[PDB]
Amino acid sequence: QVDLADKLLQVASPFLEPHLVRMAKRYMDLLWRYYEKNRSFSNAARVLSRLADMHTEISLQQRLEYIARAILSA
Amino acid sequence: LFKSRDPKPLHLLDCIHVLLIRYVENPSQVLNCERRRFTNLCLDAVCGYLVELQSMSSSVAVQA
Amino acid sequence: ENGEKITSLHREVEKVKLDQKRLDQELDFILSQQKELEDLLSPLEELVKEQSGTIYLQHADEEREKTYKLAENIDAQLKRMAQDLKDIIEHLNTSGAPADTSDPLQQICKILNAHMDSLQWIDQNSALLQRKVEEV
Amino acid sequence: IQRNTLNIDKLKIETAQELKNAEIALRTQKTPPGLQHEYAAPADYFRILVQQFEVQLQQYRQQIEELENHLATQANNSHITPQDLSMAMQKIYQTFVALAAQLQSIHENVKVLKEQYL
Amino acid sequence: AEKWEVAEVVLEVFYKLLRDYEPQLEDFGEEIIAYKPPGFSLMYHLLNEPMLELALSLLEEGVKKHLEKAVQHCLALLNLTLQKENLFMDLLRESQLVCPLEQLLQGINPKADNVVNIARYLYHGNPELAFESAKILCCIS
């Protein structure tokens, strides 16, 4: 609510991972948070893919940026 | 296309003529004299080359 | 005039073979340190599944272990990353002149950079030493 | 061969620390077994690898930050040269020359101290 | 002949067991499931030095064609371990809970011949062996 969300990336708490996961579907920020959150390439990519595929309006340019990012994680 | 067609294909002859000329200049490998004479026919410069040395042109050559 | 060269050729050749031999049998032995130090990290797989079995017949729980498990992954993780960084650098190097990689050109640019890097050291290891002298 | 000598001196040095952190490990826990204790090692060596790594991270960001300055360049990057090779080598034959300065520079400096000692 | 006869099946089971978990779900009744899979025990034993060593020598001594298969499995197995060594240490191990990792690396990274041999493998035309050999050095580095 505070838009403290960036700070969220930092939080180590073991509780955090499930938090993001459950919330994952202005959730997009949560997801921008999530793929970024995942240091791991595989997990990150899977999210951006879903991000692109997702039904909330996101421009293709972004949809592609997601793919460009996701693909890079290849 | 050249040989296969029973016909005139003057056009094909010309273009192939242009192609060979285009190709030789591009790679240094093919380069030189037996060529200028060539004005496309079944007087394939490469064809003659293939008979003696071998069919092995080399790797694929692509336009830069 | 040539014969003499021949001489210090013979010389220095069998001292190269004194070399290699040696380095040869060296590599066996550094190699054997690797077969021993391995059998027996375990048979250290006794001594550690015993502790386990023993510890299990205890009250219960295990703890403050996770931190270490985190430490090793944490220490491990960057190792992951160095590889990736290596996997990048090579690609960058790869992107560089075509029609002939096998020429001398790149040969001279590689070797030369090797020289430049070595020169760098010599520089301030020297400057080190040069630096260092001040305390004296 | 020469080059091959430093390589073994590295493998030497290393199997030696690893034999051993492997030895702070068996036989420590060998005791345990009978009943003794070896351990706040680790704490030593664990914090030692940390310190170890601490710098390696800096090395990573140093290299990363070089890469992009380099790529960055590569972007500028894009045009003929024999003269330059020469221009390079006449410069290297200067660079080696000041470097030699310094090394004799130092070397003599050491020598001076060494003289003073006796 | 008998030696390879027994060794091969175990390697195959070994590999399967590693696959017998989906690590990507985490990377990209849970506690019980994690306890149950064989992957846990497999990793546990693999860390034991007679286990890793035996697997390693297979790589050292390479080449009937049958023997070659054993070699492929050896490499693939190690690659998988390296890939998810971290997962085991931090994800899996705590859930169930036995002992740590270090002995394996010194045997692999420091044994030189293994590294050299793998390097030699890249050239070999079995793609499985070569492709995987290439991967391992990457993980080790």
Next chain:
Amino acid sequence: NQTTSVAKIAQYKRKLMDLSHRTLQVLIKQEIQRKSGYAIQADEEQLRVQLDTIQGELNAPTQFKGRLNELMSQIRMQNHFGAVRSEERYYIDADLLREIKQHLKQQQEGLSHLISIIKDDLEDIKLVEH
């Protein structure tokens, strides 16, 4: 012997690193099983402070994302572009590459002598440890 013997050195080195990982992992588990005990703290937290720092440093944020793949996003685009510009240019100059073989050999020996002299300098220096 030497050229294909590099194999043993490299293999040995990797084996070393894997054994180091196992060494560390065994070292670590001898400090969780005997050691709780639930004693453990003191020095431990300091270890732990260091480790905390390094770990989410890394994480997070910043680094990862941005950097690694502006670089990989990027690299590839430069790859695409470089190829063509290439095309041509037009041969080139390779050729004249043989030597400059040769003259680098001679710079290499000069540098190796300077490096070994600096190293000796500081010897003739720890001894300045006087």
